[PDB]
Scaffold this active site. Sequence first.
Site, PDB file in Angstrom:
ATOM      1  N   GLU A 118       0.861  -1.170   0.000  1.00  0.00           N
ATOM      2  CA  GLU A 118       0.000   0.000   0.000  1.00  0.00           C
ATOM      3  C   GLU A 118       0.904   1.227   0.000  1.00  0.00           C
ATOM      4  O   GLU A 118       1.685   1.442   0.926  1.00  0.00           O
ATOM      5  CB  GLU A 118      -0.882  -0.021   1.252  1.00  0.00           C
ATOM      6  CG  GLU A 118      -2.218   0.679   1.123  1.00  0.00           C
ATOM      7  CD  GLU A 118      -3.113   0.411   2.322  1.00  0.00           C
ATOM      8  OE1 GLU A 118      -2.688   0.715   3.457  1.00  0.00           O
ATOM      9  OE2 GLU A 118      -4.235  -0.103   2.135  1.00  0.00           O
ATOM     10  N   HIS A 151       3.242   0.773  14.665  1.00  0.00           N
ATOM     11  CA  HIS A 151       2.232   1.074  13.645  1.00  0.00           C
ATOM     12  C   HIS A 151       2.864   2.136  12.692  1.00  0.00           C
ATOM     13  O   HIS A 151       3.898   1.858  12.088  1.00  0.00           O
ATOM     14  CB  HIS A 151       0.988   1.570  14.403  1.00  0.00           C
ATOM     15  CG  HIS A 151      -0.222   1.796  13.552  1.00  0.00           C
ATOM     16  ND1 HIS A 151      -0.999   2.934  13.633  1.00  0.00           N
ATOM     17  CD2 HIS A 151      -0.755   1.047  12.556  1.00  0.00           C
ATOM     18  CE1 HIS A 151      -1.958   2.873  12.725  1.00  0.00           C
ATOM     19  NE2 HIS A 151      -1.833   1.740  12.058  1.00  0.00           N
TER      20      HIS A 151
END
EC number: 3.1.-.-
Lengths: 124, 84, 99, 150, 138, 208
Positions: free
Chosen positions: B46, B83
């Site tokens: 992505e 993250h």
Amino acid sequence: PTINQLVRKGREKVRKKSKVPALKGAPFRRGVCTVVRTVTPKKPNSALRKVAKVRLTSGYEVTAYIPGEGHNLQEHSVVLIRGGRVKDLPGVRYHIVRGVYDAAGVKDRKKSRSKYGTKKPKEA
Amino acid sequence: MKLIWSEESWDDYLYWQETDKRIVKKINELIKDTRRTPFEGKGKPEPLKHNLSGFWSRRITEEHRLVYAVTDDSLLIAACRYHY
Amino acid sequence: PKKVLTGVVVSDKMQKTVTVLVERQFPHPLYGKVIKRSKKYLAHDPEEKYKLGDVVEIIESRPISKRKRFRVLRLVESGRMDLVEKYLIRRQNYESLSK
Amino acid sequence: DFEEKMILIRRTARMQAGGRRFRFGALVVVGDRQGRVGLGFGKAPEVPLAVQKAGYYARRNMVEVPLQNGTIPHEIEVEFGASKIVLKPAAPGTGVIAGAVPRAILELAGVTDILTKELGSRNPINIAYATMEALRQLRTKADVERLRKG
Amino acid sequence: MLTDPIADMLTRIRNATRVYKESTDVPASRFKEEILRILAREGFIKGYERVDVDGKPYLRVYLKYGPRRQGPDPRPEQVIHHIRRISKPGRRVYVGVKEIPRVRRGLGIAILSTSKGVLTDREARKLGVGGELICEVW
Amino acid sequence: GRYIGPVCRLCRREGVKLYLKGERCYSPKCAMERRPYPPGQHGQKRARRPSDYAVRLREKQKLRRIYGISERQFRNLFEEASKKKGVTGSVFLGLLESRLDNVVYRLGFAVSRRQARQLVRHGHITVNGRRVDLPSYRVRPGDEIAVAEKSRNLELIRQNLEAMKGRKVGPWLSLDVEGMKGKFLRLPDREDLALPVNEQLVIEFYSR
RNA sequence: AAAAUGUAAAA
RNA sequence: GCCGCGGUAAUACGGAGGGCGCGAGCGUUACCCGGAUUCACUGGGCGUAAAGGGCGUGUAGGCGGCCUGGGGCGUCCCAUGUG
Ligand SMILES: [Mg+2]
Ligand SMILES: [Mg+2]
Ligand SMILES: [Mg+2]
Ligand SMILES: [Mg+2]
Ligand SMILES: [Mg+2]
Ligand SMILES: [Mg+2]
Ligand SMILES: [Mg+2]
Ligand SMILES: [Mg+2]
Ligand SMILES: [Mg+2]
Ligand SMILES: [Mg+2]
Ligand SMILES: [Mg+2]
Ligand SMILES: [Mg+2]
Ligand SMILES: [Mg+2]
Ligand SMILES: [Mg+2]
Ligand SMILES: [Mg+2]
Ligand SMILES: [Mg+2]
Ligand SMILES: [Mg+2]
Ligand SMILES: [Mg+2]
Ligand SMILES: [Mg+2]
Ligand SMILES: [Mg+2]
Ligand SMILES: [Mg+2]
Ligand SMILES: [Mg+2]
Ligand SMILES: [Mg+2]
Ligand SMILES: [Zn+2]
């Protein structure tokens, strides 16, 4: 619509569009591989699906899925196409029948083997 | 496509290799899944934007992740834990 | 029984012949409703006596020529130009349908 | 007391800053098998307490089902809102061929053989409410020649 | 301009009956009568009678109902629960004797003009005759 | 062919006691008398409230396992029952009993339909004269169901026809314990039979 | 008066 | 097959134990009707969900008030031939 409108016009008979032309409608179609590769899945899922471009004896050339764990499909290998899409793979509207022609059955398959073309293991 | 880490990456990687082997092997597993053909592959590629932009992100185990950069041969690992 | 129908004369433009427009009805085989359909017939009038407007009976006959497989039976009521209209008018309306 | 057998149990919910508080609801039917059915729907913060209210509420409203050899007197279509339903008497030996909901009811009503169909919004609740209101309109040649006196 | 007188009337009844009206009128017609002369001779309406409004022949139809009731909304039930016009001017509906409706299963009635009069499903079957299926009632 | 394999096990799954065995299912152990719970390694755990389907299915698998017959045939029968004018649920049972391999049991000759099938099959039985070896044969009213010469003098035939001395046969059947006979009087009614099954629910199944 | 956008893991 | 399952505890993947269904068969693909009252005659609709023609005038066509009478094409009935 008034009874007269129907009499004049009439109700429209529907029509269905073969969700998969394995051509000649035939249940299966033989074909020869041209390309075999690993393509990623759609939207939510992630994997490395195994598929193959196929030259059909029906003129067309379609991509096909190869069910099971691992295969032996190279380039000029003949395969039997089955027909059934894959809600996860773009444009894959046909499956490959394992264990037919150069299509080997799944090695070490011990469960649902009718599918996957695996003889009944002779338990020694 | 030569592999390149860096400060925060090698240290990020050593901790993985010396704190849990479940993610070490999972990490370099993708590195081989990329090294060859970047972008498309496993994890869940992505294209990134803003802070990273020119950097790409491969979903690993949800929280954790791995950022990199592709450039006509020569990959570039930037991060291993956290993250974004 | 040689079939026999009754219609009006809509064309006397032929020699020893006439066009007869025969309506008829029947219920629509799926939507009940009665419906009217019609058809012309070319009858042999050797005496050239029946003229436009005449309503007559046509009787199945031995082939006269191509198309002509009917002879005029007997007059029913002369003067019905009122119906010939419904024809000519319905006909004439075609011109308002092409391109 | 009667048979009692609930049809569906759902968990709805509402929104309130900080989250979503829930609430369940169960639709229960009830009857003997002589022609006395009751439909009750109850909402309450917990499943058990719901089927309960469903029970209590159910009994407090029922119908005289003019059974006749287990069948019904005539056939009727009743449309409760968006849902519609047809009931058609069937000679003995048939059985109740109906949807889950239009049946879970017809049994506790003492129905033996009956033909049925759900047309329109197949949604439980309304289809249920529709069948009740249906039976509640059945009439025997009795009820009839009475209203047609002289 | 009245496309179908009959359908009008059956609709007039239905409409009055919902308000629980004692009576209602409707332009006279021999055929209109023989219809009423069955809702009566069947206990649907107390009866009818040829009145005259403005020197215009009408038919006063006296509506029969049910008894009051207990519970919320005491409105009585009705004698004519369902009145419907079958054969219409836009789609006539003729039937052979062998196929005459079993209205509401015994309970209901079906009216129909035949070359023997305005019978009913029973009476029609009783004479072995068919004809235009006028309407159904119950 | 017919089921074959563990039986006082279905007695279990079905929950209801089944006389599929023979004399053992009467002692203190139709296997059911000891482990009244379903087979497998989960038989004894709070079963989930059965779905309307489950019900009609089990209720039918019950009625089929009793007469121990093929799902094929079983179905084929029902279909014929809906064919003729008669309260289907009943006529179905009525035709199920008319089987030869069944009567032979209902009549006495065997301890269980199972064994009985073996009987009829092995030509040990006969009807109105000549013999039959077709379990499914439709016994008609007034048919003499006996044994054959070569079979009259058999250990098992003895023991069975013996204990029958004193017993009562079904209200739609007779029995000449002596000559080893018996007649199909008339077609049994619903009452005369009493299987632990709801003929209704089995109809409802095959109407899905 | 005027003042933009948005850090990617849905149990 | 659909909704979807897999990132450490998966009844959803693969093996096993066990279970369910059917049995010389069981599964799969293709095609047809069904479910689909999802072309709706039986048996649907159009204010905002897809759906009123921008509005008139009017051709064909479709539809037609109260009474009496004639014909009796539709319609109903019986017989008969055929099917
Ligand atoms: Mg498919
Ligand atoms: Mg998709
Ligand atoms: Mg660049
Ligand atoms: Mg509606
Ligand atoms: Mg719907
Ligand atoms: Mg069926
Ligand atoms: Mg966001
Ligand atoms: Mg696990
Ligand atoms: Mg599964
Ligand atoms: Mg599994
Ligand atoms: Mg598993
Ligand atoms: Mg269905
Ligand atoms: Mg349809
Ligand atoms: Mg319609
Ligand atoms: Mg709109
Ligand atoms: Mg518009
Ligand atoms: Mg325009
Ligand atoms: Mg106009
Ligand atoms: Mg006009
Ligand atoms: Mg008129
Ligand atoms: Mg007249
Ligand atoms: Mg006529
Ligand atoms: Mg005939
Ligand atoms: Zn047992």
